[PDB]
Design an enzyme around this catalytic site. Structure first.
Site, mmCIF file in Angstrom:
data_model
loop_
_atom_site.group_PDB
_atom_site.id
_atom_site.type_symbol
_atom_site.label_atom_id
_atom_site.label_comp_id
_atom_site.label_asym_id
_atom_site.label_seq_id
_atom_site.Cartn_x
_atom_site.Cartn_y
_atom_site.Cartn_z
ATOM 1 N N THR A 1 0.839 -1.191 0.000
ATOM 2 C CA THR A 1 0.000 0.000 0.000
ATOM 3 C C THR A 1 0.874 1.241 0.000
ATOM 4 O O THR A 1 1.899 1.301 0.687
ATOM 5 C CB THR A 1 -0.963 0.014 1.181
ATOM 6 O OG1 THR A 1 -0.231 0.113 2.410
ATOM 7 C CG2 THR A 1 -1.830 -1.248 1.169
ATOM 8 N N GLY B 1 2.567 2.546 -2.729
ATOM 9 C CA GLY B 1 3.787 2.132 -3.395
ATOM 10 C C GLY B 1 4.247 3.002 -4.544
ATOM 11 O O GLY B 1 5.076 2.562 -5.342
ATOM 12 N N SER C 1 5.661 6.089 -4.194
ATOM 13 C CA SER C 1 6.726 7.010 -3.838
ATOM 14 C C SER C 1 7.543 6.401 -2.706
ATOM 15 O O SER C 1 7.098 5.473 -2.023
ATOM 16 C CB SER C 1 6.158 8.379 -3.436
ATOM 17 O OG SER C 1 7.183 9.352 -3.336
ATOM 18 N N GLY C 2 8.764 6.911 -2.555
ATOM 19 C CA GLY C 2 9.552 6.681 -1.353
ATOM 20 C C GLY C 2 9.814 5.216 -1.048
ATOM 21 O O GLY C 2 10.232 4.435 -1.909
ATOM 22 N N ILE C 3 9.555 4.835 0.203
ATOM 23 C CA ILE C 3 9.875 3.485 0.650
ATOM 24 C C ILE C 3 8.961 2.468 -0.021
ATOM 25 O O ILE C 3 9.396 1.360 -0.369
ATOM 26 C CB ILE C 3 9.804 3.396 2.184
ATOM 27 C CG1 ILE C 3 10.917 4.207 2.828
ATOM 28 C CG2 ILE C 3 9.991 1.983 2.641
ATOM 29 C CD1 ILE C 3 10.673 4.428 4.323
ATOM 30 N N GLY C 4 7.676 2.807 -0.170
ATOM 31 C CA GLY C 4 6.762 1.931 -0.889
ATOM 32 C C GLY C 4 7.223 1.622 -2.303
ATOM 33 O O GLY C 4 7.183 0.470 -2.743
ATOM 34 N N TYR D 1 2.461 11.519 15.765
ATOM 35 C CA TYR D 1 3.081 10.550 14.862
ATOM 36 C C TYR D 1 3.789 9.438 15.640
ATOM 37 O O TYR D 1 3.611 8.245 15.351
ATOM 38 C CB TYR D 1 4.068 11.272 13.950
ATOM 39 C CG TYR D 1 4.804 10.386 12.971
ATOM 40 C CD1 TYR D 1 4.160 9.844 11.859
ATOM 41 C CD2 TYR D 1 6.154 10.096 13.157
ATOM 42 C CE1 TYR D 1 4.852 9.032 10.944
ATOM 43 C CE2 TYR D 1 6.845 9.292 12.268
ATOM 44 C CZ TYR D 1 6.197 8.760 11.162
ATOM 45 O OH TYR D 1 6.906 7.955 10.282
HETATM 46 N N1 LIG Z 1 10.797 8.395 5.157
HETATM 47 C C1 LIG Z 1 11.176 8.177 6.410
HETATM 48 O O1 LIG Z 1 12.222 8.653 6.879
HETATM 49 C C2 LIG Z 1 10.340 7.267 7.256
HETATM 50 C C3 LIG Z 1 10.822 6.899 8.505
HETATM 51 C C4 LIG Z 1 10.090 6.035 9.297
HETATM 52 C C5 LIG Z 1 8.882 5.551 8.843
HETATM 53 N N2 LIG Z 1 8.402 5.908 7.602
HETATM 54 C C6 LIG Z 1 7.096 5.375 7.146
HETATM 55 O O2 LIG Z 1 7.294 4.761 5.883
HETATM 56 C C7 LIG Z 1 6.087 4.874 5.092
HETATM 57 C C8 LIG Z 1 6.437 5.503 3.767
HETATM 58 O O3 LIG Z 1 6.902 6.846 3.997
HETATM 59 P P1 LIG Z 1 7.563 7.681 2.806
HETATM 60 O O4 LIG Z 1 8.516 8.677 3.380
HETATM 61 O O5 LIG Z 1 8.065 6.760 1.743
HETATM 62 O O6 LIG Z 1 6.278 8.487 2.275
HETATM 63 P P2 LIG Z 1 5.915 9.349 0.967
HETATM 64 O O7 LIG Z 1 7.100 9.341 0.056
HETATM 65 O O8 LIG Z 1 5.490 10.669 1.512
HETATM 66 O O9 LIG Z 1 4.637 8.637 0.283
HETATM 67 C C9 LIG Z 1 4.468 7.209 0.226
HETATM 68 C C10 LIG Z 1 3.304 6.798 -0.649
HETATM 69 O O10 LIG Z 1 2.087 6.654 0.129
HETATM 70 C C11 LIG Z 1 0.999 6.856 -0.742
HETATM 71 N N3 LIG Z 1 -0.170 7.143 0.079
HETATM 72 C C12 LIG Z 1 -0.300 8.191 0.956
HETATM 73 N N4 LIG Z 1 -1.452 8.209 1.577
HETATM 74 C C13 LIG Z 1 -2.120 7.098 1.089
HETATM 75 C C14 LIG Z 1 -3.390 6.564 1.372
HETATM 76 N N5 LIG Z 1 -4.236 7.101 2.247
HETATM 77 N N6 LIG Z 1 -3.756 5.437 0.713
HETATM 78 C C15 LIG Z 1 -2.897 4.901 -0.165
HETATM 79 N N7 LIG Z 1 -1.680 5.315 -0.507
HETATM 80 C C16 LIG Z 1 -1.341 6.428 0.166
HETATM 81 C C17 LIG Z 1 1.451 8.032 -1.599
HETATM 82 O O11 LIG Z 1 0.734 8.147 -2.839
HETATM 83 P P3 LIG Z 1 -0.574 9.112 -2.838
HETATM 84 O O12 LIG Z 1 -0.310 10.436 -2.144
HETATM 85 O O13 LIG Z 1 -0.747 9.280 -4.334
HETATM 86 O O14 LIG Z 1 -1.730 8.359 -2.196
HETATM 87 C C18 LIG Z 1 2.927 7.695 -1.837
HETATM 88 O O15 LIG Z 1 3.092 6.884 -2.994
HETATM 89 C C19 LIG Z 1 5.087 5.650 5.965
HETATM 90 O O16 LIG Z 1 4.289 4.736 6.707
HETATM 91 C C20 LIG Z 1 6.016 6.429 6.904
HETATM 92 O O17 LIG Z 1 5.413 6.852 8.119
HETATM 93 C C21 LIG Z 1 9.124 6.765 6.796
#
Ligand SMILES: NC(=O)c1ccc[n+]([C@@H]2O[C@H](COP(=O)([O-])OP(=O)(O)OC[C@H]3O[C@@H](n4cnc5c(N)ncnc54)[C@H](OP(=O)(O)O)[C@@H]3O)[C@@H](O)[C@H]2O)c1
Ligand SMILES: NC(=O)c1ccc[n+]([C@@H]2O[C@H](COP(=O)([O-])OP(=O)(O)OC[C@H]3O[C@@H](n4cnc5c(N)ncnc54)[C@H](OP(=O)(O)O)[C@@H]3O)[C@@H](O)[C@H]2O)c1
Ligand SMILES: NC(=O)c1ccc[n+]([C@@H]2O[C@H](COP(=O)([O-])OP(=O)(O)OC[C@H]3O[C@@H](n4cnc5c(N)ncnc54)[C@H](OP(=O)(O)O)[C@@H]3O)[C@@H](O)[C@H]2O)c1
Ligand SMILES: NC(=O)c1ccc[n+]([C@@H]2O[C@H](COP(=O)([O-])OP(=O)(O)OC[C@H]3O[C@@H](n4cnc5c(N)ncnc54)[C@H](OP(=O)(O)O)[C@@H]3O)[C@@H](O)[C@H]2O)c1
Lengths: 249, 249, 249, 249
Positions: free
Chosen positions: D11, D13, D15-18, D149
């Site tokens: 879910t 997927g 952007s970013g880690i997804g 958060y």
């Molecule tokens: N980056 C970090 O340093 C970090 C650290 C610890 C944990 N995390 C966790 O890792 C995960 C990914 O973070 P990230 O930094 O990769 O985030 P991101 O780059 O901001 O976005 C990740 C993806 O989530 C999708 N998304 C957002 N809201 C959604 C929803 N309601 N339903 C379905 N898809 C949704 C977005 O596409 P759309 O906007 O098009 O829906 C985007 O493709 C999150 O759970 C975050 O809390 C990240």
């Protein structure tokens, strides 16, 4: 006494741990305000406690109740020294049978209400005030069909870590008491309404404690009172677990 | 009058946290025995404390000293209600320059001596006695050039988890106070013997604490007294951290 | 594949988890050196594994053994990329019957030997090398009559936290694998020398696991190989627990 | 091709880690379904990923979207082997300025959607399937103005502990990857919309990591793929933290 000259609020102070804590805080000299949703039990608790304990019928999940609760404190005592966010609960639901409001109900009371109880209390709390969140060993352990309850209590514990930094300018420390199994109506009701079901559940839960007994609620209250006193002046963001050993083993 | 009619032993009670703890326990009515390696400082602490405090020169790393310490208690007080295994210390040594003596000295006093202090005490401790191990946030965090000290304090915390079960039948609970940075000669001495270095280090360590100050040794002592009292009756195997937020953040 | 060309050292690789890990590392392309105190079991392990594994008889508790071991690696392979400080063990001793030799033996091999295995390894290890310490869930839980073993494993876990910082400039990451109950000769020997006793103990430990079985040593080996690989490049100071749910619930 | 023949859902997927995780899972042989709210970015992700990846526009917070998502999987692939509940996010709000909408937004996506993503997936998941929840070191640390958060991520970690037991009969394991600071748009946006502010924040967060750099999203992905593979067969309810050391020190 130890907590004399201090004003303490206990949400959900008409039964169980909330009641025992209100009793203990009052016996240490605090002026105690307790809350609860049911008027009858609220009045009975306030009478049983005596000691200038004061009751307010208020629901922690209703923003307006929280507002009214705290205005009562501003108008009466004029300040808040000790905050015990006790009001909480939980029910059983295995993964596969978790309903949307099983989730909403647990997290609204156990987590959301804690956030806003704390936030609305802050204008009444001076430098050196003490906030005690109510967690649970469920927050750091696994129990079949209690994931949502567990998740909610883990969220409570985590809030206290970050709030250390948010309240540092305000000089307010935030800690968590995490009880293990404590003999309350709350706990017993997990056994159902049958006396045998409650008794069976209570006896099973006692067999899980290394020291082999449930806590009396007064044993949890002692922890809160310690955190409320100035003796805890160098404790901040900490989790104090009173579980008879259960989660430490 | 909380620990009235209780006999308490504090190893290493002639300075710092041990001294403050002996003072506080004693201020609760406890009969206190303190130990230390240096006779002068021991005599000096016993005189300052008054209060029917009694000193014994003994090294916790010496098996015979421990035997002598406990024979003294058997002959005088006849029992032990509260045990604070305070004697401990640490020094700086980065990986790459750790000597065998650095390892042995740290683990012999901080860990081995704790094991054998507790074991030799056991015949004197009745049902309901309270043991307090002295840990540290170093046991659950990483600090450059303090691996050996950290590892030793982590070992202390783990001991209490198993000892819950080993002492279940004897009705003796085991808990851990884990201080953060507390002003103490020990702590200051990490800066060297010069006034500039001690003050610099002490101020550096205070800037690491979220509430921005070192602990006064009495602030740790209040935790030990709480653990020593019957208020802690449902706490077992737990780590109570008094660190001003540093390891919780 | 993932470990192709990497030089891995497994202390105590002639049995159990060490042996399985040496097999798995080799199957991923690593040149593996295993060690052990007994020549016969060492020779048999090297022969049974084949796959370019190499054996050295050396005791991790003997400094001179450590020196000769690492001289062997410098002269033969010329560097070390992966270090698994696996050699370790434990025995039962309740509080009240802990001998000084029981303490020393446990901590000398389980803790001290880990420290000096790592320190002597450092000159052979480049930027990007991977160190894996062998911990255990005993280090974060309580087990009746295994306090000393538990304490030693908690100390191992803490060492890695501080070594992140000690090793930062060298670019060497340090992580901990913490197995739960794994079917090894080591584990079986806790049941005694009779087959009946081993079966009884082994089935008891399996009933403690949420998923209801002991690990095969290969399942612990997979975790070590992952940490050894470049996939773990952002893991440092971490504890990876492979226990089938036991310490997480 | 460790994941050959396995059906994985990620879910969020696009952007970013997804996105990195979907890429890595696909590169190991998995059939990957990705989701996202935005059609353009979803289409771009599927085209860039190729490799038999499939996209579905769906919001994890809308029950009907989840139902449509999982029906598409039932109708197309017929099973789900790997579940990565990646979709998540957070923003800053200090205590005193936390709105009811800030709370609901964080907890609805980060916690509630995770519960119901998992629950709807279960009928598609066979014995031996692997669930990976996306946590964060924020769940176990304190960060100023990120209490909500942090609280949400600790709740995520807690969910897996109980789900070990809920999913025992099903043979499905549940583990948590907890990233530290990882270079994503998500993280960058915390600096605001200006390039200068995003760059400043990203460099500040890199200085908080002991190894002195942010993770590339692929470095988190390797952890997820490991948990997705059969190598994690004895890992259940565990938290694997990939943080460059930050929460371990
Ligand atoms: N980056 C970090 O340093 C970090 C650290 C610890 C944990 N995390 C966790 O890792 C995960 C990914 O973070 P990230 O930094 O990769 O985030 P991101 O780059 O901001 O976005 C990740 C993806 O989530 C999708 N998304 C957002 N809201 C959604 C929803 N309601 N339903 C379905 N898809 C949704 C977005 O596409 P759309 O906007 O098009 O829906 C985007 O493709 C999150 O759970 C975050 O809390 C990240
Ligand atoms: N008992 C245990 O073993 C245990 C263990 C760990 C943690 N805890 C936690 O400790 C706390 C107290 O538990 P307990 O066993 O003492 O519970 P309890 O006896 O079932 O109830 C305590 C009190 O909470 C009040 N209350 C409930 N919902 C409320 C609301 N929305 N607003 C205001 N007051 C409310 C109740 O009065 P009304 O119903 O009239 O409102 C009652 O006076 C909870 O947070 C619980 O999760 C308990
Ligand atoms: N201070 C801190 O910030 C801090 C933080 C966390 C944990 N701790 C722990 O708290 C404990 C007390 O520390 P502190 O800073 O108060 O230390 P300290 O002031 O340097 O000394 C404490 C006492 O230990 C005694 N002692 C030392 N070695 C001994 C031995 N082998 N046998 C008997 N007594 C011995 C000393 O007397 P003699 O030298 O005359 O024997 C002294 O009275 C230690 O375990 C320490 O690791 C301290
Ligand atoms: N098995 C479990 O369930 C479990 C769980 C958690 C952690 N662990 C840890 O995993 C490690 C391996 O345990 P295991 O069950 O695989 O043990 P095991 O079956 O007894 O094998 C241990 C190996 O260590 C070698 N060894 C022992 N002492 C040594 C020394 N001083 N120097 C060099 N080599 C030495 C032994 O060979 P020689 O006897 O020939 O010297 C043998 O090859 C230990 O650290 C243990 O504490 C095991």
């Amino acid at each position: 006494k130890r907590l004399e000259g201090k004003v303490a609020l206990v949400t959900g102070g008409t039964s169980g741990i909330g009641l025992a804590t209100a009793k203990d805080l009052a016996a240490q000299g605090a002026r105690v305000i307790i809350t609860g949703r049911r008027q009858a039990e609220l009045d009975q608790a306030v009478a049983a406690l005596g000691q200038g304990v004061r009751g307010v019928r208020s629901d922690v999940t209703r923003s307006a109740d929280l507002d009214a609760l705290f205005e009562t404190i501003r108008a009466t005592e004029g300040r808040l020294d000790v905050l015990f966010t006790n009001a909480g609960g939980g029910s059983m639901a295995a993964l596969g049978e978790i309903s949307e409001q099983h989730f909403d109900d647990t997290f609204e009371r156990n987590v959301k209400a804690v956030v806003f109880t704390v936030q609305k209390a802050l204008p009444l709390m001076p430098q050196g005030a003490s906030i005690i969140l109510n967690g649970s060993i469920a927050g750091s352990t696994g129990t079949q069909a209690f994931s949502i309850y567990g998740a909610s209590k883990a969220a409570v514990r985590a809030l206290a870590r970050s709030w250390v930094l948010d309240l540092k300018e305000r000089g307010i420390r935030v800690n968590v008491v995490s009880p293990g199994s404590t003999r309350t109506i709350g706990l017993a009701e997990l056994g159902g309404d049958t006396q045998e079901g409650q008794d069976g559940l209570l006896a099973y839960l006692a067999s899980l404690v290394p020291i082999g007994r449930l806590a009396d609620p007064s044993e949890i209250a002692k922890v809160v009172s310690f955190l409320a006193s100035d003796d805890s002046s160098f404790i901040n963001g900490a989790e104090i677990t009173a579980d008879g050993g259960q989660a430490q083993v």
